[PDB]
Structure 1
């Protein structure tokens, strides 16, 4: 006898993790559901799931992780620490393993979706969840979060943390320092305002361990303190879980630039200590993940709640964040590619996908190498025109093929595949899905290189069929990769209706041929291929592998690719490169082209003199992977601004020494910026572009060099 209710799970959270008596290979997890009925009144549910050592290792990617390690990692949240940055992989693996075990041992769960939930009154835990037949869900309600905390880390502590790891992002140094001496969070200041649809909650704190200076609202109108007695099976006694059940909201929302992670860690740490100071209950897990918990950081901002409080929070686009939360069970971006398969399960699937392919593409996968030429490209520098040039894309093809080949190798445990398939189907219509896949596919292929190999081989097959059909549909593929490729036609450059007809016929022919080939290789697709014509052009110039510029001499539209865009200065440089290429190719020898190119460079440098003191303008973004010149401890005194540093470091050169513009308050006061250095880099890029254009349109071996030392260096030095 199990009692069933029509509910909807607003959030799935991790409450307890332990190991039952005389257990050495399997642990147990007590998982807290924030649920909501049709009326939206919140209720609290619990489930208990079991994970074996093999599942944990499979979700971890290696055999290093031990069950005893997860046990001590989850007992250690007495909430004063910040444990998940001791081993972020451990916590991602544990979260993904618990969610997989929950879907496997209790039912197909779905956030914000109608479910029928059945619990065992004797034990109190939820015993089985199924997909509800009918019922409109409650509307996911948001609350607006503003949290700002002043935390006093000694700058030399950050200096030492960065000195141990020279490429450490300073948000990670901030969090590592807070982990070293947690009292910094207790004796810090904090202002928090939480606005729901009902009332306003607000607290202002001088020492976050002392009573508030400013109060506005009660703490019992945001949430509800619930005590639920459970009887986890195989364990001696009844245990009580004390939880916070958010009234009339399901997730927080935090702004982008104002977001601070230690602020919310300190706030939730004080909430945890206040709520769980009363004895006679269980202390939840206190775990948070984000880009800021890795030394090298992480590109996409987020921070995922694993434990207390029990509900999401979005560092934002709000609709897309909610959709990505719902469609992925909230494990993304927290778990990474683990939201599809455990990494240790990717080899076999790849093998299976290889085994099901036709022998030719089998060998293509077997031999695949990144640099291997596949089709008859244009061998830059080259120029085409006046012709009819077209650009084509298979929008989202890599994600499509990954989903298809995963379902092909499914003979190697598939709810992750269903999530990936729904993402693939959703990409043609809502862009959050495509944005997710842009990060998900590379991460998946980083999980296993055999996947790179398989997917590149199938891409090679696609390229081969594109060339084959191009031969027969009046098309010569001049460049591209296979999911996006450009080429030229043999049609009269003067008849435009005939042109458009030929573009359309070629598009249909190529789409049909690629679809047929993928189908013959048994690679079935979740939504049928669409071949998008990105644009029609009349001239094209290629100077590098990905450096290409397209011009349409009849409506004056361009497209530029391969030009770095690592600052506003490079944006302006791209703009002038496209303007000057418009003029140069409208000039239809090399002498006049060089005259126009040097005029463009001179005008660029004058306009750059008009911005000779703009730090943000001349700052370039350096990634955690390029070398970066350090700076004296002065940047280490930035304070809260150090936390909004997880991937990119904007750096200027002043008079030459680097300055992380973003690490200091405003207004900045600096020596004059070394505009000579920045303009030299920018002009090196521009000379690559111009040299390619000259060698393509006129075959001149004389490269474009713009003399800077002579002629317009005096303005700065």
Structure 2
């Protein structure tokens, strides 16, 4: 505490990792943790520093989100993870515990020592007698150094009996195969020592190549020295939670900061085995502690996740970024990844929604925020129900034309609403240090307009927070309903008539002479400005303040509109041949040709509609429609031998066919199966119609004739769903559209 012995230096931090987790001598209420920073100076010189924090049990329970956890379990898992020779995949048993642990330790470190940030200058003050960082402050001393990268390529060959995979899959009928491979490897660790491996690392100064026939013996091919990539350091500490002196052995990288790996073929087991060998090799001589060995990813859950990553929580000490290749914007992708890593402190996406606020504090904040609002808004919030209709007076099939139609949008309203509402309710927080979390969120919003990565992060993040607590859902629904009602009321006096939408984006019709073109461009702008001002005033009325001022955008002007359902709609402009289509499913490469055909046929029919002809026109229209379908089928004949063209995508929450046993013999192709599964259908005999997972077999394939009638019928149903509505709406008919597939062109594929 004394300031007469504190030594101050100016440096920068590039990574924070977890080193040790233990329990003090005589206490069962809390535990202690020891963390390790890798800092750099103003010209580029690595150094290692250590800090220690203490965590209670109430905070741990709050971050977990339930009351079925204990400090004993945390300590037991942390102690077990220290030995990777026998237990290398500890976080696969229970991931939520590790997520809560990481989040709580980070928050405690931020609150106790002080404010910290990555890739920014800082002033660090330490105690010379004990050797632990004691204070951190933010200052400015110049243009800090620039990050550096290093390319990595690894390949491993592991062998596992297909019977184990089959049994594990049978245990859980809807599990992904990467998790099955990981679990099988976990059961018998020794199989990770007999694998054959190859590694190639390219840096800006050297190169490192290795080829092991078996990971337990000397390399068969070698190039480079280990004493160049990294440096081994020994430090002597003296924490307050131990009775005797302690020593720590760490690795310090040389001339780089993080690894970058292409996403063409990424496999976790290769990295796990390589790092396991390094951990075993380095920590052999007795006389020092050992770090933890933990990792995280989307393959540690039974059903996977939609966004891939690879999070490192302990050994060795630096992050790894997996970026899909074959994209002309690879540099942009890597820049976005680095920016996201720096901005959010590295927790995202590992922790999830705990980077903002703990999941056991939301209800109080939501209640306090809602308690103020305004009487009418409170009444609206109390009665909110998902399936309700307020403003959007149209219906199933209906056509408008020729008039001036317009489409407007508010870009990014939910995130702004959440930020403002959380700020309003923050007065109810039972802590003065949680605001930092909210602060982070605010920054993201201000960066959304000019940075795509911020927009993607917010889009992925808001649904998680909403799903955490339904009170947020209700509050947002009520506020949005009030906004929509005000919008409609104001728009009812500028020659505007709302025809569709929900409030975030909508479309409507204007009342003006349909001939003059130089006078129809002076009424849309006035309406847009008036609506913007009215919405701003209504929001400001209910003591709600926004960082970014509202801005409403016009997305096009058309003349014809057709609506055939509650989510499908077609707009057309009869002066430049521009059009827009919304509400068509797309689950494969053969669902785009149908969209193109639909667009062309609709354009032709609506162009012919301006012939001012009696009911005969309808008959003519029908003819055209049929013709289009005919051509489509004929065109599909030439692509009858393509397997990937006809394959369709399936998600974990739907029902699919059983997995054929042979698929379990694929090997290393089962690692990249996070979320989707692609399936095709073939006929090997008579009427069998068996399924095939395309992506689990080596290329090229050898299959019987494809099944084209099934897929063609599936597409044709959706094709007709729109033509029927167009016919019933434009001409007020009563006959459905039906195409005789079974009696006209079914002989081609028989």
| Shift, 1:74, TM fit | 4.9
Residues 77 and 526 of structure 1, relative CA distance in 2, 3 Å threshold: farther
Report how far residue 429 of structure 1 moved: 0.6
Change (3 A) 1:186 1:375: same
Off by >6 Å, runs of 4+ in structure 1: none
Q: Which moved more, 1:172-181 or 1:594-603?
A: 594-603
TM-score of the pair, normalised by structure 1: 0.96
Q: Which ranges of structure 2 fall in alignment gaps of 5 or more residues?
A: 324-332, 429-433, 609-616, 684-688
Q: Deviations over 1:600-623 (max 9, x none)?
A: 322222222222222222111111
RMSD: 1.9
Alpha-carbon spacing, 1:546–1:281, altered in 2? closer, same or farther (3 Å): farther
CA spacing shift, 1:236–1:631, aligned 2, 3 Å: same
Deviation string for 1:630-681 (max 9, x for gaps)? 2222222222221111011111122222222112121122222222222222
Q: Could you give the per-residue CA deviations for residues 674-698 of structure 1, whole angstroms, max 9, x where no partner exists?
A: 2222222222222222222223222
Q: Distance in 2 between matches of 1:424 and 1:298?
A: 25
Contact residue 85 and residue 276 of structure 2 kept, 8 A: no
Q: 2:635 & 2:113 partners in 1: Cα distance?
A: 65
Aligned to 1:640: 668
Q: CA deviation at 1:70?
A: 5.4
Partner Cα distance (1:580, 1:76) in 2: 67
Shift of 1:423: 1.1
Q: Give, in angstroms, the shift of residue 299 of structure 1.
A: 0.3
Ranked by relative contact order (alpha carbons within 8 Å, sequence separation 6 or more), the top structure is 1
* Deviation for aligned residue 1:452: 1.4
Residue 141 to residue 674, structure 1, CA distance change in 2 (3 Å): same
C-alpha separation between the residues in 1 aligned to 2:736 and 2:295? 54
Q: In the alignment, which residue of structure 2 is the partner of 1:500?
A: 521
3-state SS, counterpart of residue 341 of structure 2: helix
If the length of structure 2 is used for normalisation, what is the TM-score?
A: 0.92
Post-superposition offset of 1:420: 1.2
Residues 242 and 704 of structure 1, relative CA distance in 2, 3 Å threshold: farther
Distance 1:638-1:514 versus aligned 2 partners, 3 A rule = farther
Tell me how far apart the structure 1 counterparts of residues 373 and 303 of structure 2 sit (CA, whole Å). Answer: 38
Indicate how the Cα distance of structure 1 residues 81 and 531 shifts in structure 2: closer, same or farther if over 3 A, else same: same
Aligned equivalents of 1:167, 1:296: Cα separation in 2: 7
Q: In structure 2, do the counterparts of structure 1 residues 493 and 409 end up closer, same or farther at CA, with 3 Å as the change threshold?
A: same
Change (3 A) 1:509 1:213: farther
- Taking a change above 3 Å as real, the CA distance of residues 499 and 43 of structure 1, as seen in their structure-2 partners, is farther
Q: Does the C-alpha gap of structure 1 residues 558 and 36 become closer, same or farther in structure 2, counting only changes over 3 Å?
A: farther
| SS of residue in 2 equivalent to 1:339 | coil
Mean alpha-carbon deviation: is it higher for 494-503 or for 255-264?
A: 494-503
Task: Give the alignment partner of residue 4 of structure 1, picking from 5, 8, 17.
Answer: 8
Quick one: distance in 2 between partners of 1:538 and 1:391?
12
1:703 positional shift: 2.3
Pick closer, same or farther for the CA change 1:347–1:197 going to 2, 3 Å.
same
After superposition, the Cα gap between the structure-2 partners of 1:410 and 1:583, relative to the gap in structure 1 and judged at 3 Å, is: same
Compare 305-314 and 35-44 and name the one that shifted more: 35-44
In the TM superposition, residue 586 of structure 1 has moved relative to its aligned partner by 1.9
Single out whichever of 283-292 and 61-70 deviates more from structure 2.
61-70
Which residues in structure 2 correspond to 1:136-215 (within 5 Å)?
Answer: 136-215=143-222
- Offset, 1:368: 1.5
Note if contact 2:22-2:75 (Cα within 8 Å) is conserved in structure 1. no
Name the stretch that deviates more: 100-109 or 665-674: 665-674
Moved more, 18-27 or 107-116: 18-27
User: What's the CA shift string for 1:119-171, capped at 9, x where partnerless?
Assistant: 22323222222222342121111111212222212222222222222221111
Per-residue CA deviations over 1:252-297 (Å, capped at 9, x if unaligned) read 1111121111111121122222222332222222111111111110
Paired residue secondary structure (1:582): helix
3-state SS of the aligned residue for 1:438?
helix
Determine if contact 1:156/1:633 at 8 Å carries over to the other structure: no
- Most deviating of 658-667 and 598-607: 598-607
Task: Go from structure 1 to structure 2 and tell me whether the alpha carbon gap of 1:600 and 1:206 turns closer, same or farther (over 3 Å shift).
Answer: farther
Tell me, yes or no, if structure 1 residue 300 matches structure 2 residue 307: yes
Distance 1:334 1:624 in 2: 21
- Residue 489 of structure 1, CA deviation: 1.6
Q: Secondary structure at the match of 1:75?
A: coil
Deviation string 1:3-34 (CA, Å, 9 cap, x unpaired) is 22222221111121222223323222222222
Q: Could you tell me how far apart the structure 1 residues matched to 2:547 and 2:43 are?
A: 36
Q: Quote how far apart the aligned CAs of 1:71 are.
A: 4.4
Q: 1:468 to 1:40 in 2, by over 3 A?
A: farther
Deviation of the 1:68 alpha carbon = 4.8
Counterpart of 1:409 (choices 419, 425, 434) is 425
Residue 418 to residue 363, structure 1, CA distance change in 2 (3 Å): same
| Structure 1 residues 328-373: Cα deviation after superposition (integer angstroms, max 9, x where no partner) | 1111111111111111111112112212312222222222222111
| Count of residue correspondences | 716
Distance verdict in 2 for CA 1:177–1:378, change over 3 Å:
same
Moved more, 498-507 or 186-195: 498-507
CA contact (8 A) 1:388 1:537 kept: yes
CA contact (8 A) 1:361 1:458 kept: yes
Between 1:224-233 and 1:144-153, the stretch displaced more is: 224-233
Quick one: structure 1 residues 18 and 667, their matched pair in 2 at CA, closer, same or farther if it must change by over 3 Å?
same
Q: Any idea what SS the aligned residue of 1:580 has?
A: helix
Distance 1:613 1:23 in 2: 71
Conserved 8 A contact 2:81-2:87: no
Cα distance in 1 for partners of 2:236, 2:632 equals 71
- Change beyond 3 A, Cα 1:357–1:263: same
Structure 1 position 441, deviation (Å): 0.5
> 1:73-98 CA distances to partner (integer Å, 9 max, x unpaired)?
65565674211121111111111111
